[PDB]
Amino acid sequence: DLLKKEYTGITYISGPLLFVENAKDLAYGAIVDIKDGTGRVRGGQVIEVSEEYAVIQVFEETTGLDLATTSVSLVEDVARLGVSKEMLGRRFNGIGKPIDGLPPITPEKRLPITGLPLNPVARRKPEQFIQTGISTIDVMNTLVRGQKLPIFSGSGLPANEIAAQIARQATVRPDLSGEGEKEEPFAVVFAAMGITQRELSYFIQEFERTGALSRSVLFLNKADDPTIERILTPRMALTVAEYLAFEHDYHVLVILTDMTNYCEALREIGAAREEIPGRRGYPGYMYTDLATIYERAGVVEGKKGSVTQIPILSMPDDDRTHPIPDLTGYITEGQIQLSRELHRKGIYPPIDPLPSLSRLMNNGVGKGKTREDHKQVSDQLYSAYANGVDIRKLVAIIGEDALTENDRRYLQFADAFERFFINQGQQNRSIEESLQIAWALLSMLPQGELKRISKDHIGKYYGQKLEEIWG
Amino acid sequence: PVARRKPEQFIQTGISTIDVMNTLVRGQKLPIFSGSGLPANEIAAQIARQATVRPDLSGEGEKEEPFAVVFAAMGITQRELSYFIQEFERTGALSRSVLFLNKADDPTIERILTPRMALTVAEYLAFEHDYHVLVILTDMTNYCEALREIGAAREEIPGRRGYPGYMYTDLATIYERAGVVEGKKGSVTQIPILSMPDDDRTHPIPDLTGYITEGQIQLSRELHRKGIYPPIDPLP
Amino acid sequence: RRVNALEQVVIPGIRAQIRFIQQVLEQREREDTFRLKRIKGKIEAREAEEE
Amino acid sequence: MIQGVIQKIAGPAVIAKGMLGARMYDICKVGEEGLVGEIIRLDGDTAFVQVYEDTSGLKVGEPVVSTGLPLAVELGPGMLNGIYDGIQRPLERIREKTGIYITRGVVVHALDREKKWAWTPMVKPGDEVRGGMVLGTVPEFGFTHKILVPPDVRGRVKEVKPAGEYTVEEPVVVLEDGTELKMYHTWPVRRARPVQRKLDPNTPFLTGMRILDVLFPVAMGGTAAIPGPFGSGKTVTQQSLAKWSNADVVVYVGCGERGNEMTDVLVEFPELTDPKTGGPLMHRTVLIANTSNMPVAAREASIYVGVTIAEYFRDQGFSVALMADSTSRWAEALREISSRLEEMPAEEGYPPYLAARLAAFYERAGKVITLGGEEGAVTIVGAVSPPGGDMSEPVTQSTLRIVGAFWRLDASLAFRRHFPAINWNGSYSLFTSALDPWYRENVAEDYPELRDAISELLQREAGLQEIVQLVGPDALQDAERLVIEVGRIIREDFLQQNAYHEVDAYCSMKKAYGIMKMILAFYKEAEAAIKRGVSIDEILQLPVLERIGRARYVSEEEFPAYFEEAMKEIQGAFKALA
Amino acid sequence: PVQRKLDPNTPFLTGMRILDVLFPVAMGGTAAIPGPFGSGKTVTQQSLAKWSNADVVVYVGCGERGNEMTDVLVEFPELTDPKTGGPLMHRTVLIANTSNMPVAAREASIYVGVTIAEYFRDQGFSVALMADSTSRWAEALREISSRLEEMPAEEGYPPYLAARLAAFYERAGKVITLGGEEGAVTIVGAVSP
Amino acid sequence: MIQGVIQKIAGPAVIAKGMLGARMYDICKVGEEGLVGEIIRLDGDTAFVQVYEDTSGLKVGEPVVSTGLPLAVELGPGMLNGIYDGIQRPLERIREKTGIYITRGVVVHALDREKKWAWTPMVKPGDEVRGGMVLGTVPEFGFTHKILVPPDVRGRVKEVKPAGEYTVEEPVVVLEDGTELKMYHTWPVRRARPVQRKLDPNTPFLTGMRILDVLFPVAMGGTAAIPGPFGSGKTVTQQSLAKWSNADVVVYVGCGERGNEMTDVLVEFPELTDPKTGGPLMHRTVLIANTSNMPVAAREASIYVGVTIAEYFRDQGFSVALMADSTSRWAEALREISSRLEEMPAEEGYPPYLAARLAAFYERAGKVITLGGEEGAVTIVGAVSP
Ligand SMILES: Nc1ncnc2c1ncn2[C@@H]1O[C@H](COP(=O)(O)OP(=O)(O)OP(=O)(O)O)[C@@H](O)[C@H]1O
Numbered sequence A: 001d002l003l004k005k006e007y008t009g010i011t012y013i014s015g016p017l018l019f020v021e022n023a024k025d026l027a028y029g030a031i032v033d034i035k036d037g038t039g040r041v042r043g044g045q046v047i048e049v050s051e052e053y054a055v056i057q058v059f060e061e062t063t064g065l066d067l068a069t070t071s072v073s074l075v076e077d078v079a080r081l082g083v084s085k086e087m088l089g090r091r092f093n094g095i096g097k098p099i100d101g102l103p104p105i106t107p108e109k110r111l112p113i114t115g116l117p118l119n120p121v122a123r124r125k126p127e128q129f130i131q132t133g134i135s136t137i138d139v140m141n142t143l144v145r146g147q148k149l150p151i152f153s154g155s156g157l158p159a160n161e162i163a164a165q166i167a168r169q170a171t172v173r174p175d176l177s178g179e180g181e182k183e184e185p186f187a188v189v190f191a192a193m194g195i196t197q198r199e200l201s202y203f204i205q206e207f208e209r210t211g212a213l214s215r216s217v218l219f220l221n222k223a224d225d226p227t228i229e230r231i232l233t234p235r236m237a238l239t240v241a242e243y244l245a246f247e248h249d250y251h252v253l254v255i256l257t258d259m260t261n262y263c264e265a266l267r268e269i270g271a272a273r274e275e276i277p278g279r280r281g282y283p284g285y286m287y288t289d290l291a292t293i294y295e296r297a298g299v300v301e302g303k304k305g306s307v308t309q310i311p312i313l314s315m316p317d318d319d320r321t322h323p324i325p326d327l328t329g330y331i332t333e334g335q336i337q338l339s340r341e342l343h344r345k346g347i348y349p350p351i352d353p354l355p356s357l358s359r360l361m362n363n364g365v366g367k368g369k370t371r372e373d374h375k376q377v378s379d380q381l382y383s384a385y386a387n388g389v390d391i392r393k394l395v396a397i398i399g400e401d402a403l404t405e406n407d408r409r410y411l412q413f414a415d416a417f418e419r420f421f422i423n424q425g426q427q428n429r430s431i432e433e434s435l436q437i438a439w440a441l442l443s444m445l446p447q448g449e450l451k452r453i454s455k456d457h458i459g460k461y462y463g464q465k466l467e468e469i470w471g
Numbered sequence B: 001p002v003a004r005r006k007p008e009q010f011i012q013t014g015i016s017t018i019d020v021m022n023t024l025v026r027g028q029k030l031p032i033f034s035g036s037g038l039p040a041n042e043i044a045a046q047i048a049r050q051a052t053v054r055p056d057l058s059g060e061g062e063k064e065e066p067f068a069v070v071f072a073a074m075g076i077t078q079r080e081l082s083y084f085i086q087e088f089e090r091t092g093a094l095s096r097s098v099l100f101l102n103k104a105d106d107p108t109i110e111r112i113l114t115p116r117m118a119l120t121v122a123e124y125l126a127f128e129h130d131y132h133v134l135v136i137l138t139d140m141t142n143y144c145e146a147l148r149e150i151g152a153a154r155e156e157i158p159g160r161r162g163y164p165g166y167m168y169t170d171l172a173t174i175y176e177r178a179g180v181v182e183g184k185k186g187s188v189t190q191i192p193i194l195s196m197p198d199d200d201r202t203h204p205i206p207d208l209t210g211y212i213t214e215g216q217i218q219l220s221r222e223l224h225r226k227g228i229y230p231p232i233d234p235l236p
Numbered sequence C: 001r002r003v004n005a006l007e008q009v010v011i012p013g014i015r016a017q018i019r020f021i022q023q024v025l026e027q028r029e030r031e032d033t034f035r036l037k038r039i040k041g042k043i044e045a046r047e048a049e050e051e
Numbered sequence D: 001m002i003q004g005v006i007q008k009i010a011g012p013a014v015i016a017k018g019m020l021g022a023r024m025y026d027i028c029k030v031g032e033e034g035l036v037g038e039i040i041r042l043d044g045d046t047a048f049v050q051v052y053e054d055t056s057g058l059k060v061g062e063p064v065v066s067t068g069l070p071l072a073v074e075l076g077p078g079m080l081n082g083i084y085d086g087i088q089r090p091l092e093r094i095r096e097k098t099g100i101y102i103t104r105g106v107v108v109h110a111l112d113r114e115k116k117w118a119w120t121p122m123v124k125p126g127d128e129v130r131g132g133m134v135l136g137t138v139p140e141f142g143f144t145h146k147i148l149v150p151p152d153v154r155g156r157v158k159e160v161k162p163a164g165e166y167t168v169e170e171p172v173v174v175l176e177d178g179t180e181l182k183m184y185h186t187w188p189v190r191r192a193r194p195v196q197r198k199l200d201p202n203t204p205f206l207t208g209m210r211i212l213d214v215l216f217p218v219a220m221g222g223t224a225a226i227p228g229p230f231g232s233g234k235t236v237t238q239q240s241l242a243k244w245s246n247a248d249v250v251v252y253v254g255c256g257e258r259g260n261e262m263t264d265v266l267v268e269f270p271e272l273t274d275p276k277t278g279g280p281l282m283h284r285t286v287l288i289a290n291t292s293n294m295p296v297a298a299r300e301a302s303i304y305v306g307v308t309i310a311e312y313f314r315d316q317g318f319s320v321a322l323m324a325d326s327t328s329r330w331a332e333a334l335r336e337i338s339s340r341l342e343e344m345p346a347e348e349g350y351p352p353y354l355a356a357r358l359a360a361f362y363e364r365a366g367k368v369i370t371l372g373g374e375e376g377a378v379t380i381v382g383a384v385s386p387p388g389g390d391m392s393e394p395v396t397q398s399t400l401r402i403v404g405a406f407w408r409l410d411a412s413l414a415f416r417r418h419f420p421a422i423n424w425n426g427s428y429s430l431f432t433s434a435l436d437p438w439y440r441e442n443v444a445e446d447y448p449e450l451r452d453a454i455s456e457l458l459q460r461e462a463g464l465q466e467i468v469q470l471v472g473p474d475a476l477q478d479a480e481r482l483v484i485e486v487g488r489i490i491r492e493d494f495l496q497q498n499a500y501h502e503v504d505a506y507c508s509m510k511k512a513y514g515i516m517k518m519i520l521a522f523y524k525e526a527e528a529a530i531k532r533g534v535s536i537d538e539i540l541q542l543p544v545l546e547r548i549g550r551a552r553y554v555s556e557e558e559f560p561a562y563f564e565e566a567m568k569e570i571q572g573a574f575k576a577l578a
Numbered sequence E: 001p002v003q004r005k006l007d008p009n010t011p012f013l014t015g016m017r018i019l020d021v022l023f024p025v026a027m028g029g030t031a032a033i034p035g036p037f038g039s040g041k042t043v044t045q046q047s048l049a050k051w052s053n054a055d056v057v058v059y060v061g062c063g064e065r066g067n068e069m070t071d072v073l074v075e076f077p078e079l080t081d082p083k084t085g086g087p088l089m090h091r092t093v094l095i096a097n098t099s100n101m102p103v104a105a106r107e108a109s110i111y112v113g114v115t116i117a118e119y120f121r122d123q124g125f126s127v128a129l130m131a132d133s134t135s136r137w138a139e140a141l142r143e144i145s146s147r148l149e150e151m152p153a154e155e156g157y158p159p160y161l162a163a164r165l166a167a168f169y170e171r172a173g174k175v176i177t178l179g180g181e182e183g184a185v186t187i188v189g190a191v192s193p
Numbered sequence F: 001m002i003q004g005v006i007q008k009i010a011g012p013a014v015i016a017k018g019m020l021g022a023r024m025y026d027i028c029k030v031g032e033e034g035l036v037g038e039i040i041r042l043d044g045d046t047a048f049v050q051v052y053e054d055t056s057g058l059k060v061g062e063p064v065v066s067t068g069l070p071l072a073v074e075l076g077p078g079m080l081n082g083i084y085d086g087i088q089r090p091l092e093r094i095r096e097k098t099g100i101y102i103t104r105g106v107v108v109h110a111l112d113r114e115k116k117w118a119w120t121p122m123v124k125p126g127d128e129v130r131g132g133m134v135l136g137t138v139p140e141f142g143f144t145h146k147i148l149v150p151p152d153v154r155g156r157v158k159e160v161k162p163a164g165e166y167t168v169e170e171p172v173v174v175l176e177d178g179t180e181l182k183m184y185h186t187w188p189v190r191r192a193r194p195v196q197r198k199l200d201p202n203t204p205f206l207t208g209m210r211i212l213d214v215l216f217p218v219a220m221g222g223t224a225a226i227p228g229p230f231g232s233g234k235t236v237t238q239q240s241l242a243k244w245s246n247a248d249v250v251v252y253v254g255c256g257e258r259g260n261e262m263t264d265v266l267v268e269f270p271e272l273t274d275p276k277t278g279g280p281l282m283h284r285t286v287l288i289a290n291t292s293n294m295p296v297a298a299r300e301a302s303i304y305v306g307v308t309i310a311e312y313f314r315d316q317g318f319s320v321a322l323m324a325d326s327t328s329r330w331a332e333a334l335r336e337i338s339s340r341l342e343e344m345p346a347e348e349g350y351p352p353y354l355a356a357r358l359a360a361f362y363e364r365a366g367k368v369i370t371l372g373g374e375e376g377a378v379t380i381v382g383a384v385s386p
């Protein structure tokens, strides 16, 4: 038409919802603009429709709205975001508007933010090993390109510093696999849900220090921003990441700051609609909603791009059985779990190796990729550490003097393992140095009890002294 | 209640741990408590195959009276069905018994109606034709679960943990049908069988059964894993 | 010494944990009963009153 | 056909009006885009439709047309070596038609209509046919595929075409009433296929894993469940069962899990070798995939399609194995749909009819005598992720009462990388006694006695561990210390199995019997030497301990010489000690 | 209603050594005898019925197992009254319920018994009331409240359980009747945790 | 204005009808008594009002009048050395009017309209002024109180009152468009006050306690939480921080606590000495009191009023410390209000939007560069009583 239609029959405003009764023309899932009587425009999304009435959720706050003057206008039927290659180095808010003072982006394409599932035929196996520079991740919980590897954190634990260090130090090793020329740097897409000024300032300073803002795209949604806007931020971030990776052959690394806040907003919307709850408070469909976010990563046959995700989430009472960590561990391809007890002893990074897991480790290790002894060394380290922890629990009861020689050896191995292997500070370690330290630690035990390593590898590498590396 | 009389005669089940230390008396409701992997079906089949009354030890020698077994199976699978058919038909025990079977894929209301038909037949035979009958209910956990499903389908608010509030009354109308009546010669004896879901005796189903029944027989997992059959623990 | 330690320290702690867990589970069952009451009241309202 | 319009859209639910005449569980076409939906309600002139595809973008007033038929599958040649979505649409055709993304409204046939198959008749005019009888033979890889009369057809035949190559749409039967039979027929997924008779289970389903085959067997027609928290090893165990079991055809069903796990099967399997035929392993596998980010309502249809295909391959005479990736996702889908209907739920929000669905699904498994007079079997292994936290959730409790085996996994064992991490105390099986006659003939005459001795040793070890927590390992006497050490030996050597090792991934029956014999002989010798006054500490220093602990990695054909040498060394070492 | 409630000052001679000596109960007082199964509740209650110095005895079964109720129904008439040598059932009133009676009948069992005891109190007698397994009466009350959707409070019991228990026990006491005479009611109740 | 009548009463929740045209989160006058209420729902011709005072004795049919404005405070000279109710009412004026009991329906002004203040101008006619700029100074108890342009004001000035003594409600500056600027302005308590930039905290907030200063420091402009059971020492710690800390202005919020804990502060503080100026300690402290037996719905308003005043004193260039006595009572107030609305609750009956409110409240704290150019900071210490 020459001028667009407006709907005025609004009789309900309560919380985030809003009912309009003359709106059968609005498509399900459409985006609308809510006009105040003073001229202010607020956005909203339609999730119900009938010949009787329609239900609209509001992104911004509902202060100042009235039932006599408010009107609803129509934007396009599908939530679409305009993307371009020119948007590298820009900053955006939670809904995609610029906040850096620069003119807006002229779109090359406009894409639906909900995305589409990847065809399981069109995928391929993640293979490339990524050297993060942290021994407890490189050796025992290896990260490969194309993996979803969330970080399970507490309240006072430093997950942000670990994420920044990984993003700074991450690189591939073409020389080990023989793939030829060195890579190009990762492109970082940073999506922030409800985040304090302290964490945001730290992240901005860290990215400015290394010059990574020229490659990055930032979607920011602060703690004082409206809550319902957090629904759209991960979807827009992943739309941009998918476009860059699969249309321009970039290697994209995506960081999601706190999935807990996203789940809180989701619970707010679900409880407003009287949905059937899940276990504690959260709606019953939360598994499906999280699955549409995580499962957008991976690699695609016949294309050079890749998408890697590092979500960060906080287990509330350090509880692994909470619904959010449970569903995340069901969907993702592993987890890195931080330990508070190691943090209290001054160990950084405080990664607890036993609850940690990497599902796609076996694709990226072995001969011709890193080295031939990687997997057996990892297994032996795991078994020895478990024995050390069990002997700790034993000497908590019976006392140190009652120990034999074997239990004392395992106990000393566990202590030295923590102090030297885990505690590394801000230093950067290559894979060879980490393997050398791991072999030096295993040399504290007799050859008889390490049954998980083949005798050739023992004959080749066993016998190193730790004093040469640390003295 | 003024028509009943006190139970005074025993039944020889053929199992030493039950006959000697936990004697079964005509008119008693004596449940068998079992776990998940424990062989309750084999014990039930053996008891139904072996049980008989002993008139020679009673009185001067007594006069013989008929005996019968009524068997009710609720929520059994195909394997248990084939096992029970082959067990009963291979030794002539079927000639004195009545079988009510309800497979797991059968509707739930039939599972609800299954034990009441068995008890109706038992009452008819005992108090019309002076039989001594023995009623065995294969699994009460299945009955409780079917009752929960039926109650939830009719929009009834549940009770203590998940189960409906009237479950205590509903189980009582099943157990309290057994007994022995003054002025009559027949009697009805019940042996309920149930599997404890959490393997805990504080679950509502084992707890409410202890209020109505007159004892218990408990199967032991350690004796079962050691190669002992039948694994009846004499202590609890 | 071992008997005294087991009688004094371990058993009361285990008992306190047991009763705490029981109280939390009871609270959760009460809350879901309230939710069921509300949804039944909502269901019965919309089926009869509307014309 | 019944036609109507829409006035309600809310997620995966669509309510239509003007639909008087529709039937329950029919298939409807929704909107001008042509989406596939199913009817579950009737209320006056309105109907309630759940949609198997995404519903965003639809508008009120678009037409809805009912096809008048329930959900059905196409059964015939060409299903092997394929991968399908939740409603049986091939994904390779979608990949050809569309890009890397799955769009809505794609129309493709389940069976390829272009391929020509060799036909060889088995009947002549004037013969009487019946439901389930075979007539014809089509070669398909290493198998010979049989064309079956549909179960609802009876009549007399006067038409046969001679040997030639025809498409699957070519009808080569004419009955006296004039009906035609083709190489394929359609069957509704919610009706169980009829059989003639059921049979007792008397043949083991060999999985190739030591603990599952030895301690907790499952029969050829039986059912099993494997519950455990995330990261415990359900999917790896199921894929090992897919690779190494002796089933003729394996149907793998993915319900609400990751797409990378399906890509791994799609890539690795064409390289591997079929254990019993020597061809590629992918020629025997059928995949049904409905990943986690696909629409919710298709999760139930995937399970029913999988079980219907498995039942179809049973009627030909094969022994079929079925792997269900997660039934908890099916339960969550049923909870999601029930929210729109506004019903009153059960304990954890699940609908009350959930327990009947699982029972109806598991009851399809068994060894039967088919309508064609042959013998087939279907065995179902269903992984149950405990949805919220633990084993007390209603899904696991409902599964516990209808399964013959129960393989409980432990998170604590998976933390210390002790795979397969089967909890020995909380697991059981019911197929031991029935399988005992087979073991005596085919494995060894004394094999059940060895199994009972191993179980007795594990029970003795489990008994003593209570005392160890109480006083510590130093207070135990020498006999109990020996029992503890032998239990540790059994746990480290016999039970543990690496699924990614080159040799340890598969273990035959006789190798397991040899290892058990070695361990029991060592225990007997050690107890005898204890009676002669030897302290336990010097016994464990023997070099034969390393010989036993590395008997896993010996190859299958190298094993008998190793067994002979190890037995001789076992005899030699303890004779010189005292 | 009564005229005035008096303080208890005469012992309820149970006829047992330990209960009369160490832990006495006064006329008009209330006593509770709990214990798990097999402890000895039923035998003691019946001994109190047989040997006490109360003029009239009321026996209430809140709903028992059928065979035990049969046992107590058969065993009671055979005994003899220690006061006069006559039948014991001449001075007793028996309230009997099993587990398959309607749930409304079992809840109102203890109120009928206490009403009859109060009726005999107004005539000038001393009445002893024995209640068997008030836990099962509590279970009946819980089931009735679940039928009415009463939002359970402590474990499954309705929030007003303590009020009903208080209303039941407070009827016991030595009073001056409206006719100017003196009577008393003594309540002994067995609890089964 | 919009006017309507009442038809429903249930505790502190009043439902009005005939209110077509009322806006969300406005302020209404309820009944003949003239109570204060706030609208949080709209449905047809009706509105749902929560009442900040006692609703006993109300009847169906009493009139409801809407003021058309949200809940706002008066910011200006005269707030120091004062004790206020949960919706900014001076308590000593209420004592003078009613006596020793706090009755409902009392109308008082927040700032004293009859005190003379010394005025010293800064601007000249023809100057261009913006939001947050400084125009004039007024002497207070040791401090220099600056008169600020309201943040949403731009214009040019040609009128300045000369140096003299005026009340708070006399126009001292007149803009070119005719806007008159007084010594005070109003701000809605739910909106965060604008700033230019936020800075990283780098100087300590000295509390005078050894364990808190040495082991677990808090920086100037940060946030901290102090949980603990009853009898652990939260109130004594917070009062010690009020006595000894180096903040320029201390704002103390009592949200649903004992009245004795506020009477002790009222009595004892004027006898003490300010650490950094030497005057009475009460001259730097502002008290907001809402005890436990006062109306429940006024607890939220007290928190927002306190944080708004603390934000106002930040823009003048001071360093402000805010102490909240308990946020658990605020959570209980939210639970009660949601229970009147029949919303589906989260764990333990709290509404699902509970975390958003706490996030928005603590986000007000930080070290900023004010609109006028000075540097201020607000630090928040909140006690949790689980
Ligand atoms: N038998 C085994 N041998 C070696 N490694 C194993 C074995 N079983 C499991 N693992 C290791 O443990 C990991 C467990 O991942 P897996 O996919 O099996 O999890 P799951 O318990 O099925 O969980 P879910 O399907 O819910 O994500 C494997 O990726 C592998 O690294």
Ligand SMILES: Nc1ncnc2c1ncn2[C@@H]1O[C@H](COP(=O)(O)OP(=O)(O)OP(=O)(O)O)[C@@H](O)[C@H]1O
Binding pocket: F228, F229, F230, F231, F232, F233, F234, F235, F236, F237, F385
């Ligand atoms: N630092 C201290 N020095 C001396 N006495 C102290 C100190 N801290 C606490 N106390 C004592 O303990 C009491 C604790 O009272 P306080 O009001 O501080 O407790 P609270 O944790 O705030 O409790 P409430 O939840 O009741 O407000 C004080 O009244 C005082 O007697």
Ligand SMILES: Nc1ncnc2c1ncn2[C@@H]1O[C@H](COP(=O)(O)OP(=O)(O)O)[C@@H](O)[C@H]1O
Binding pocket: E036, E037, E038, E039, E040, E041, E042, E043, E044
């Ligand atoms: N005075 C007594 N003399 C002998 N045995 C007694 C006496 N009192 C109780 N008992 C024993 O206590 C046991 C429990 O009896 P009873 O009270 O009938 O069951 P419960 O304690 O389970 O209610 C009986 O077996 C009985 O022999």
Ligand SMILES: [Mg+2]
Binding pocket: D234, D235, D236
């Ligand atoms: Mg898996």
Ligand SMILES: [Mg+2]
Binding pocket: E036, E037, E038, E041, E042
């Ligand atoms: Mg008793």
Ligand SMILES: [Mg+2]
Binding pocket: F234, F235, F236
């Ligand atoms: Mg205090």
